[PDB]
mmCIF file of C-alpha atoms in Angstrom:
data_model
loop_
_atom_site.group_PDB
_atom_site.id
_atom_site.type_symbol
_atom_site.label_atom_id
_atom_site.label_comp_id
_atom_site.label_asym_id
_atom_site.label_seq_id
_atom_site.Cartn_x
_atom_site.Cartn_y
_atom_site.Cartn_z
ATOM 1 C CA UNK A 1 3.424 12.418 -2.097
ATOM 2 C CA UNK A 2 3.758 8.576 -1.430
ATOM 3 C CA UNK A 3 1.612 7.673 -4.688
ATOM 4 C CA UNK A 4 1.528 4.709 -6.268
ATOM 5 C CA UNK A 5 -0.458 1.562 -8.048
ATOM 6 C CA UNK A 6 -1.268 -1.253 -5.956
ATOM 7 C CA UNK A 7 0.816 -4.207 -7.349
ATOM 8 C CA UNK A 8 -0.798 -7.045 -5.750
ATOM 9 C CA UNK A 9 -2.619 -8.008 -2.031
ATOM 10 C CA UNK A 10 -1.261 -11.374 -0.605
ATOM 11 C CA UNK A 11 -4.552 -12.039 1.476
ATOM 12 C CA UNK A 12 -2.753 -15.418 2.478
ATOM 13 C CA UNK A 13 -1.073 -13.087 4.410
ATOM 14 C CA UNK A 14 -2.682 -10.351 4.682
ATOM 15 C CA UNK A 15 -0.444 -8.062 2.861
ATOM 16 C CA UNK A 16 -0.629 -5.317 -0.195
ATOM 17 C CA UNK A 17 2.551 -4.330 -2.160
ATOM 18 C CA UNK A 18 2.181 -1.048 -3.779
ATOM 19 C CA UNK A 19 4.789 0.191 -6.706
ATOM 20 C CA UNK A 20 6.936 3.261 -6.272
ATOM 21 C CA UNK A 21 9.768 4.737 -8.150
ATOM 22 C CA UNK A 22 11.690 4.470 -4.879
ATOM 23 C CA UNK A 23 10.443 1.176 -3.979
ATOM 24 C CA UNK A 24 8.156 -1.414 -5.651
ATOM 25 C CA UNK A 25 7.638 -3.151 -2.359
ATOM 26 C CA UNK A 26 5.433 -1.061 -0.154
ATOM 27 C CA UNK A 27 3.771 -2.889 2.417
ATOM 28 C CA UNK A 28 0.251 -1.706 2.846
ATOM 29 C CA UNK A 29 -2.016 -2.922 5.436
ATOM 30 C CA UNK A 30 -5.724 -2.433 6.367
ATOM 31 C CA UNK A 31 -4.593 -0.717 9.699
ATOM 32 C CA UNK A 32 -4.237 1.983 7.947
ATOM 33 C CA UNK A 33 -6.708 1.984 5.733
ATOM 34 C CA UNK A 34 -9.504 4.636 5.302
ATOM 35 C CA UNK A 35 -13.264 4.667 5.163
ATOM 36 C CA UNK A 36 -16.130 5.833 2.904
ATOM 37 C CA UNK A 37 -16.226 2.285 1.669
ATOM 38 C CA UNK A 38 -12.792 2.364 0.372
ATOM 39 C CA UNK A 39 -11.688 -0.728 2.477
ATOM 40 C CA UNK A 40 -10.836 -2.807 -0.620
ATOM 41 C CA UNK A 41 -7.399 -2.396 -2.482
ATOM 42 C CA UNK A 42 -7.394 -4.200 -5.620
ATOM 43 C CA UNK A 43 -4.517 -4.945 -8.170
ATOM 44 C CA UNK A 44 -3.635 -2.218 -10.764
ATOM 45 C CA UNK A 45 -5.384 0.942 -8.745
ATOM 46 C CA UNK A 46 -3.914 3.893 -8.338
ATOM 47 C CA UNK A 47 -3.837 5.171 -4.782
ATOM 48 C CA UNK A 48 -2.282 8.004 -2.644
ATOM 49 C CA UNK A 49 -0.531 7.664 0.688
ATOM 50 C CA UNK A 50 1.916 8.392 3.383
ATOM 51 C CA UNK A 51 5.045 5.684 3.800
ATOM 52 C CA UNK A 52 6.960 5.129 6.988
ATOM 53 C CA UNK A 53 9.780 2.637 6.914
ATOM 54 C CA UNK A 54 10.551 0.796 9.872
ATOM 55 C CA UNK A 55 13.386 -1.378 10.778
ATOM 56 C CA UNK A 56 14.371 -2.102 6.926
ATOM 57 C CA UNK A 57 10.627 -2.413 5.880
ATOM 58 C CA UNK A 58 8.697 0.555 4.020
ATOM 59 C CA UNK A 59 5.094 0.139 5.598
ATOM 60 C CA UNK A 60 2.217 2.156 4.217
ATOM 61 C CA UNK A 61 0.009 4.592 6.492
ATOM 62 C CA UNK A 62 -2.754 7.113 5.986
ATOM 63 C CA UNK A 63 -3.891 5.654 2.850
ATOM 64 C CA UNK A 64 -6.188 7.727 0.550
ATOM 65 C CA UNK A 65 -7.784 6.955 -2.808
ATOM 66 C CA UNK A 66 -6.480 8.229 -6.099
#
């Protein structure tokens, strides 16, 4: 149920941040992005996905469009 709004994507590094109630700093990266043309993450759009926290660091995995 890791649904949230994409806050912004720092293309400088290649990381996107998505805002959640539990944490507004979810690292989304295009290594877990879907297809169907939806390979673009844009600030202010809503998405649904899964989040796997690593060694202090919640990253997004399995990204689906809301």
